[PDB]
Amino acid sequence: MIDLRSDTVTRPSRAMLEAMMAAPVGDDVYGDDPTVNALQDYAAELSGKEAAIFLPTGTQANLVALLSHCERGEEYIVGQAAHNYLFEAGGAAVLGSIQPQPIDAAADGTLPLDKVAMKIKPDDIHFARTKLLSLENTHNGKVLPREYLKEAWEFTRKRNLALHVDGARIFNAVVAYGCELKEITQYCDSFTICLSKGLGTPVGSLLVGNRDYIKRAIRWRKMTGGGMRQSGILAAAGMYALKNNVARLQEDHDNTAWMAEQLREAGADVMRQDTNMLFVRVGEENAAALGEYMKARNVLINASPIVRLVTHLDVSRAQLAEVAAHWRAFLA
Amino acid sequence: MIDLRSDTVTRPSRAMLEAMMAAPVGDDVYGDDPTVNALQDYAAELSGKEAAIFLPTGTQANLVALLSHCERGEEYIVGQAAHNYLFEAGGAAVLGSIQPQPIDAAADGTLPLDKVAMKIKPDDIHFARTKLLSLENTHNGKVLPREYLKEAWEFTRKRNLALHVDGARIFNAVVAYGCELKEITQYCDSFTICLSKGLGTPVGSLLVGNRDYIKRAIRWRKMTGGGMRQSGILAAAGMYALKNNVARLQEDHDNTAWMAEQLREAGADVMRQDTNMLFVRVGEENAAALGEYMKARNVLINASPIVRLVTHLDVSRAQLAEVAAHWRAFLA
Amino acid sequence: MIDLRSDTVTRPSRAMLEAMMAAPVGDDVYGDDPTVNALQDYAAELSGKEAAIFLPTGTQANLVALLSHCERGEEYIVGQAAHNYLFEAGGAAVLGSIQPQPIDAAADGTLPLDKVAMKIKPDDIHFARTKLLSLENTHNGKVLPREYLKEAWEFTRKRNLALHVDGARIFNAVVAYGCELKEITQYCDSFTICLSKGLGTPVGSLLVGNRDYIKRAIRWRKMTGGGMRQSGILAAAGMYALKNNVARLQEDHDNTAWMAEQLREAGADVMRQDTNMLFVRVGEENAAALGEYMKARNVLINASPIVRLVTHLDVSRAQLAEVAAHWRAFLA
Amino acid sequence: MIDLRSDTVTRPSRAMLEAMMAAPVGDDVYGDDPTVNALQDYAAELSGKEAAIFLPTGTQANLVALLSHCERGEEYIVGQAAHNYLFEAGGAAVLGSIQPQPIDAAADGTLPLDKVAMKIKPDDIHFARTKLLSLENTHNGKVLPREYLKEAWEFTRKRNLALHVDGARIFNAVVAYGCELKEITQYCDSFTICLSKGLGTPVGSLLVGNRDYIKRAIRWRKMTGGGMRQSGILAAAGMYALKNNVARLQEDHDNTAWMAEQLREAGADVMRQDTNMLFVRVGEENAAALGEYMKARNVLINASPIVRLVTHLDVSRAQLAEVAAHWRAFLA
Numbered sequence A, B, C, D: 001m002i003d004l005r006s007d008t009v010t011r012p013s014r015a016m017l018e019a020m021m022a023a024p025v026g027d028d029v030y031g032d033d034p035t036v037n038a039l040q041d042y043a044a045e046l047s048g049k050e051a052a053i054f055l056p057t058g059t060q061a062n063l064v065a066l067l068s069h070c071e072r073g074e075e076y077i078v079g080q081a082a083h084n085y086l087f088e089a090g091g092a093a094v095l096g097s098i099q100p101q102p103i104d105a106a107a108d109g110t111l112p113l114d115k116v117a118m119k120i121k122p123d124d125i126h127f128a129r130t131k132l133l134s135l136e137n138t139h140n141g142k143v144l145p146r147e148y149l150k151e152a153w154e155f156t157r158k159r160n161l162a163l164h165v166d167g168a169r170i171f172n173a174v175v176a177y178g179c180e181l182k183e184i185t186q187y188c189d190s191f192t193i194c195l196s197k198g199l200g201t202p203v204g205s206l207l208v209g210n211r212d213y214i215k216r217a218i219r220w221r222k223m224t225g226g227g228m229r230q231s232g233i234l235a236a237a238g239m240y241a242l243k244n245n246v247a248r249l250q251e252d253h254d255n256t257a258w259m260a261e262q263l264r265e266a267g268a269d270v271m272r273q274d275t276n277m278l279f280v281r282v283g284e285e286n287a288a289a290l291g292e293y294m295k296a297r298n299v300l301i302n303a304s305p306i307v308r309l310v311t312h313l314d315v316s317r318a319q320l321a322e323v324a325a326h327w328r329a330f331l332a
């Protein structure tokens, strides 16, 4: 079927499945899984960091990432629309006892440093203790300006703040940048990697940072429930994906801007196109209707005034042609 | 000694102390303290609410209120500069496992209902569960419009959201409206009352609401550590304060409005003036230099590029006239 | 390789892997994964419960269960040596703001109802609010008496307390009782099921209960980070495991009971033997020395003055006979 | 009236009241209260510690004491029947995110060190991180053996554990010991002092420890709501009590063992007598009945199978004679 709801719907490729069934495993609680360790070391090395850790979800990757950075009473400055603030049921505050300090991101997706500075609280018993600055490289598809990344890292060091990046779709950014992962990963103390979305993995996310940081991450992961056993089978896929599915992300990107043009031709009001994501202003009076129309044509989208269409390896251009045709028919 | 730093410096008048030293007391934990109970029933009756609870501080009155309103994982929309979000060291999140959703307040001190609406979370496992809208009347002196208070009240009912008002200086707004307290508390499910501010009490606050709500608040006040014993001694100052110090707040207002013209007609840059508060932009170069010049003449003002002068019952106009002069002498 | 450390080392059989590699999957967050849903409905139906939820680990199945049962400030009575109190880094309190009330378990593994009763808190603001009684069937191998399970069930209803059972090895007790799973799950409101232990799955657990309870558990599983995507691949091993690996647990039991006689009739001090678990008091002087002697011959046993040997599908009797010999050779 | 429910019902003496109305005050949030500072320095000096802090309640003193000692995920070993575990609505876990590890106290009221050692968790991700050992000198009236205090302190230093003592009635212990406060205070890193119970204060408790510890206590107190303003009026009483009400505690003690004898003569089954507390095994079938009988004779006690009678300065021996007579009449 044609699914444009999220790149999270990506299913295992033939090659990936065999890599998995082939991978050697062990008990990762003891650290005896060759594959988990191999994936963790690859990411670490690939990003220029000391150590990495495998978690069940990107949600748990960020929760653990936040608990690891901030103690009870500390606070993190994040985007009002960032994932580890808005889309993680408020875990950091509810579970971690961390005060969140959200601020609106700028149009390009960055967090205005002048605003971040204004939110750093003085060492007064009145306020929470600002500790972390969280970013999200690839925010609703937008790739942060490389210069800004350098600026934030520099900014944080000057203010003694830790810097963490939600790299759910960090490889989309990499491919869009045209550089290596380590070249953007140098500007953050820690960052996450989701294997389950664009890279085509069934389950999996990674938190990468220095040795000590990750050791604290290990205690938190166990507590939050991520301490799995024979994760080797899952990690195997993650290794295969990092060595065979990063480059093709460019194919998704061209499909996004290709589709963006088709919908423009058809008459749909396209709001913007960034990486594997495009947004259309469908409208309130056409939301649910378009949903059904499509859903009928075996096309799955998230019905809404502003529909977010996401691309991935399980959607071809030909299939996009179909949806662009079905859409054109909708509007006229 | 001339303290324009805050209205929190007000000291007990001899009549207040006597009222305290001659009050009958009992074990409040056992609910055997006459004066405490008397103070509560009086606040409840005067505001149209069923019950009331006395607490050590407003900070605790709000932490308790927030805990009594939101279960673990629940959320409260508030102002980025509001007290129960910014000035209570993130208590609601750190201790109460409550997710805070702060937004910028409009110029007049209100939380734009349109902005508030966009922040109400869809009922999806993705988000925290929006449950409370917490206001602040008298917000840095600013008196919230009355039509907004009625509109927020209606908005929250149609959204099934509770409405709480941090009334640390509610009586200041009350005198400014020229109405009864009941006429504004009718637009909220719960509100607080600090007696230790302009009303001149040594310490103590009140949280008022529905009988069942307050019953829960009693469990939280205990856990947080506010369940005192013979606190009727303190509650006594409260009654005395509520029966004699409400009307004279108009005197503080006139003085602030007075000082404003004097400082203005003296070379000072008066940004704005609301109730017992005045704001003068002094700037870097003269900030710290101003604090010292004053500190010497016994005039205490929180130095800063933008100084906040707070009038209260312990600062006379004559004394203000003096400071004024001392400020017109600062420029030369 | 001979791992008697835990039954958590069980590795996937080729038939299990195939079942996993050929399973249809979908986005579980969207509830679109056939196998995951299939696995849940099967566990629910087989236990007499309305709903079921798949999780990354048992540790998370219990944290979620506890959170779904107790609101902030609520409490759960448990065993001092129980898993959701002792071996999950205090998660219920640290992350869930739940007060734990642990008590020593009787010799047979049960929590003495008389002791439990004394621990139920009076409804007074002095105490936490007792709400759950959490058991553990198979408790270090010990099979809880059936009359106690029925008695705890009745006790909790007459006290209006929920009853949860940590069933990490529930099927081990089940085979030992010689009854159906439904006949014991009928005595609890919720229970867990680990598939990654004796049942031989690579990872995964289940929490089962009433439809409304489980709906809440879904919100908590997300927040804690267990809301995976195409997890049907994992859920597949679970179904395969539940349809083929339950009965053969009797083989582990016989082997443990077998090894016990061998080690006993060899000079070893066998304290006790329950289901797939055996305990031998080795003592200080021979503890670490034993671990090394074994470690060399590839036999892995958690060294300690009191060694805990765990049998499972990946350790044959023939292999046990070998270890045995290697142990009778340790004394000389 | 005659109140034997608790020494918390103690009311202000003429001398105390005048000391209060006389005391000079200020804003303690800024630290400008002469009296609060004077009380804090007196306690500190009197106990041989660096600094002290004034809180509204003993409950908040312990909560703050626990938050100050243990970070999120750390754990404290305390008595199953200790106040900061059982009688503080579980604040440490609910609010502080601290895992509690309670164990039964021995008959003399101490925590068997052999048990404490058994509960210290290894540095493994399975367990919470043992950090603090909490004691309660004067536990239900029992005075801990001095030798044991020395032992626990020594024990904790050897194990790198912090030691805290709930000194709600620490002065009862002092008077019973016959030594100075500093001689028992040397065996703890921190300890609390309740001014509101036996010492005859209306409100008030103190936490005493080293400079850094108390500084952390200050941030926590503010967050939990204890940061009061003109606390001078309350502190004044606390100073008067520490200089005029410690010695007479002996009068309460003799009244307790005097009354214990009278009740024995009358026929009541006295369980034990320690300091200002005695326990009678009234029985279930006579609980409520005795309550009314007494309550009628204007005598207030906590009705129960085992009645706890507490002495204090507001109950004279003559009044005890009355109650012992009313009791005798009850039984015969």
Ligand SMILES: *Cc1c(COP(=O)(O)O)cnc(C)c1O
Pocket (backbone or CB within 6 Å): A057, A058, A059, A060, A062, A083, A084, A136, A138, A166, A168, A169, A194, A196, C227, C228
């Ligand atoms: C989806 C997502 C996450 C979390 O991953 P889940 O698999 O949904 O838990 C974190 N950050 C971003 C930016 C995401 O898009």
Ligand SMILES: *Cc1c(COP(=O)(O)O)cnc(C)c1O
Pocket (backbone or CB within 6 Å): B057, B058, B059, B060, B062, B083, B084, B136, B138, B139, B166, B168, B169, B194, D227
């Ligand atoms: C001062 C104040 C509080 C709380 O008072 P504390 O005594 O500092 O705890 C709450 N809200 C507002 C708006 C205040 O100005």
Ligand SMILES: *Cc1c(COP(=O)(O)O)cnc(C)c1O
Pocket (backbone or CB within 6 Å): A227, C057, C058, C059, C060, C062, C083, C084, C136, C138, C139, C166, C168, C169, C194
């Ligand atoms: C192993 C186990 C758990 C949880 O399993 P993890 O995979 O370690 O999270 C829960 N309860 C018992 C009794 C166990 O033995």
Ligand SMILES: *Cc1c(COP(=O)(O)O)cnc(C)c1O
Pocket (backbone or CB within 6 Å): B227, B228, D057, D058, D059, D060, D062, D083, D084, D136, D138, D166, D168, D169, D194, D196
């Ligand atoms: C009463 C008491 C406390 C707490 O004091 P409150 O005034 O009740 O908050 C702490 N410890 C002991 C041993 C007590 O008896």
Ligand SMILES: [Mg+2]
Pocket (backbone or CB within 6 Å): A007, A008, A009, A010, A011, A196, A197, A200, A201, A202, A203, C229, C230
């Ligand atoms: Mg996928």
Ligand SMILES: [Mg+2]
Pocket (backbone or CB within 6 Å): A093, A094, A095, A096, A097, A098, B093, B094, B095, B096, B097, B098
């Ligand atoms: Mg919390």
Ligand SMILES: [Mg+2]
Pocket (backbone or CB within 6 Å): B007, B008, B009, B010, B011, B196, B197, B200, B201, B202, B203, D229, D230
């Ligand atoms: Mg005051």
Ligand SMILES: [Mg+2]
Pocket (backbone or CB within 6 Å): A229, A230, C007, C008, C009, C010, C011, C196, C197, C200, C201, C202, C203
């Ligand atoms: Mg396994």
Ligand SMILES: [Mg+2]
Pocket (backbone or CB within 6 Å): B229, B230, D007, D008, D009, D010, D011, D196, D197, D200, D201, D202, D203
């Ligand atoms: Mg008292």
Ligand SMILES: [Mg+2]
Pocket (backbone or CB within 6 Å): C093, C094, C095, C096, C097, C098, D093, D094, D095, D096, D097, D098
């Ligand atoms: Mg907590």
